[PDB]
Structures are given as structure tokens and as C-alpha cells.
Design a binder for this molecule. Structure first.
Ligand SMILES: Nc1nc2c(ncn2[C@@H]2O[C@H](CO)[C@@H](OP(=O)(O)O)[C@H]2O)c(=O)[nH]1
Ligand SMILES: Nc1nc2c(ncn2[C@@H]2O[C@H](COP(=O)(O)O)[C@@H](O)[C@H]2O)c(=O)[nH]1
Ligand SMILES: O=c1ccn([C@@H]2O[C@H](COP(=O)(O)O)[C@@H](O)[C@H]2O)c(=O)[nH]1
Ligand SMILES: [Mg+2]
Ligand SMILES: [Mg+2]
Lengths: 162, 161
């Protein structure tokens, strides 16, 4: 039962924009930078980011896609390139680990970074994002729902409880 | 040229005792926990912690050894709390291989990393759960961790070319 809306379109906007700036700044430009979406809602975020970057720096960033289905609970630039994984939500980090494995299976990255719209904590591996839209503390039970216009009709992040 | 000394026998002694209490407090008891040192000094660091934790909680924590050059008495892993132990966290690339190792052998409940020092310059989204000490450094500089079991004495230092 949707407890509360944590992020509205506006917030999602401001966060995404800030992150774009962060990314450019932490890499001193976007040359050698590749954005990679982890699953459906991560590809869209990654696409938006590239869009912003494209807007701020006047140069475009390559975008890759990763449908981490090889999670047993088209190629893109890699070698000596800065692979920036993008995902909407970060929980245990098991998905990011796979993403890493995949990325490196595909070449020698100069380094891989992580950007997520939200970090709900409860990590299970020594992993952390380099860019975070918003930390949303949560209970192990609770579920974070990220809705994105490209797929859900609207932009909104919310917490649901059983 | 050794730029300095950033950690001596006393700093190290404290850092580990802290981390030992830290590990315990963070898992609400060492039950289910396991230590896994990375390379030689990583293994000794693991043993020191195991000893302290024991001195502290009384129980004992298994200590496994892991080499990373092939990755560049069965040991508990699956459903255990795997605490990787290494002396220096640099690019994080070594920890990545170590995870791959661990998760290839079994399915751990969770994996945690503990290091004596973290000199930054991460090249992967990896971070220690427990850190002896952060020592900012230049890409050029080199951190040297000396441990009595191998180097005759305990001391961490920064060297410059
Ligand atoms: N209903 C439901 N959704 C989950 C559960 N675990 C994760 N999710 C999230 O629900 C979303 C889709 O409605 C997914 O977002 P994603 O695109 O970040 O992976 C997924 O992450 C779960 O147990 N139940
Ligand atoms: N949006 C969302 N996905 C979640 C959440 N918890 C787990 N997941 C799922 O877990 C994957 C990553 O899980 P993790 O490795 O971070 O625990 C995501 O791609 C998603 O399918 C949550 O709170 N929100
Ligand atoms: O100044 C340094 C940096 C790294 N290392 C070695 O590199 C490992 C760190 O791996 P990584 O994070 O560079 O991948 C350490 O345990 C250590 O054996 C050193 O000896 N000195
Ligand atoms: Mg996601
Ligand atoms: Mg080491």
C-alpha cells in the first residue's frame, strides 16, 4: 500500500540534472565516458543522462544497454573507457556485481562507476554508487517503486509496505 | 624515498581492535561470520582479528586464505557472512576478483570488506565496510604496510619515487 511519494517529477528532474553535472565534473569532461543502463528502467535513466550531458557539454556520450537476465538467484565501448553503470535502484548490490562481470567480460575498462536514482541501503556486498539521486532509508520489508514516464506514464518514486 | 610513517605499531594495534569490535557490533554477534584474508598480509591481518574477536566475544571465527594471481578441510562460505580482509584498498580490482572467487565457491549471505588502509583512487564501485585508516595519496606514491609476521615490525608508510 503506497506509503508515501518520496520523489515527484520535479525532484527526479533536479536529481538527474545534478548527477549529470556530477558525472561531467568527476571525469573532467565526458571523453572516454560511456553510460550503461542496467535493465529497462536503468537504460531510460542512462538515456536521459546522456541527453543532459549532451545539453551541458555540447558533446554526446555513448549509451549501452544491459538486460541482466543472467542473474541466477548490442555491444558498446569498453577498453580504457570509463564505464558508468546506471540503475534506478540500489539494494543488495548483487545486480551491480553482475553488471561489472558483464562489462569486464566485454573488455578492459579504465574504470567503472555507478549512478543510481535511489539508494535504499541494505547492501550485501562491498559496493557503493559514485552518484546517488537520493538515499531513501527503508525497512527490509518495504519496496521502492520508481516510475518513469517512458514506461510508467509518469515520473515518481514511492515507498510501498505490505 | 620514504615520505613518512602514517601508522606505527600503536596505531595499527588500535585500528584492528576497533575493527574487531566494529565487525562484531555490525553483525550483532560473530555467529555465522567468517574471515578471509587476501594474500599474505591479508591473511595475517585476518588472524589478528580472529584472535581479538575471540578474546572479545569468546567464540572463534574461521579464517580462510585466498590468493589472487590465478584471478589477478572445506571452508564455510554459503549462507555465511564473508568478511574479506586485505591490507590496502587501492583500485578495488583485487576485491572484485576476491568476490568472484567467494561467490564461485558458494553462496554467502553477504560479503564484507575490511582493510587496514584505503588510499583511494578507486576504479570500481567498491568500498570497505571497515577501514583501519584512510590515507589520501597521489597516483605516483606507494603505501608500504609492514607486518611483524613478515617484515619484523608493524608500520605503515608513504614512499615517493
Ligand atoms: N512487486 C515487486 N517489485 C519488485 C520486487 N523486487 C524488486 N521489485 C521492483 O519492481 C519494479 C517494477 O515494477 C522493478 O524495478 P527495476 O526496473 O529497478 O528493476 C523491481 O526492481 C518484489 O519482490 N516485488
Ligand atoms: N526499484 C527497485 N528495485 C529493487 C528493489 N529491491 C530490489 N530490487 C531489484 O533488485 C535489482 C538489484 O538488486 P540489488 O542487487 O540492488 O539488491 C534491481 O534491478 C531490481 O530488479 C527496490 O527497493 N526498488
Ligand atoms: O600502495 C599500494 C597499493 C596497492 N598495493 C597492493 O595492491 C592490493 C590492492 O589492490 P587494489 O585495490 O589496487 O585492486 C593491496 O592488498 C596490496 O597487496 C600495495 O602493496 N601498495
Ligand atoms: Mg533497477
Ligand atoms: Mg593485500
Amino acid at each position: 500500500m503506497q506509503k508515501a511519494v518520496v520523489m515527484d517529477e520535479q525532484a527526479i528532474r533536479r536529481a538527474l540534472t545534478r548527477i549529470a553535472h556530477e558525472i561531467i565534473e568527476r571525469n573532467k569532461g565526458i571523453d572516454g565516458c560511456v553510460l550503461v543502463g542496467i535493465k529497462t528502467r536503468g537504460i531510460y535513466l542512462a538515456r536521459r543522462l546522456a541527453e543532459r550531458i549532451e545539453q551541458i557539454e555540447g558533446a554526446s556520450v555513448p549509451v549501452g544497454e544491459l538486460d541482466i537476465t543472467l542473474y541466477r538467484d548490442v555491444p558498446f565501448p569498453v577498453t580504457e573507457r570509463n564505464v558508468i553503470l546506471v540503475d534506478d535502484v540500489l539494494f543488495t548490490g548483487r545486480t551491480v556485481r553482475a553488471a561489472m562481470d558483464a562489462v569486464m567480460d566485454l573488455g578492459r575498462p579504465a574504470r567503472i562507476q555507478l549512478a543510481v536514482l535511489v539508494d535504499r541501503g541494505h547492501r550485501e556486498l562491498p559496493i557503493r554508487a559514485d552518484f546517488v539521486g537520493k538515499n531513501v532509508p527503508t525497512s527490509r520489508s518495504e519496496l521502492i517503486v520508481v516510475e518513469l514516464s517512458e514506461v510508467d506514464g509518469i515520473d515518481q518514486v514511492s515507498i510501498h509496505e505490505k
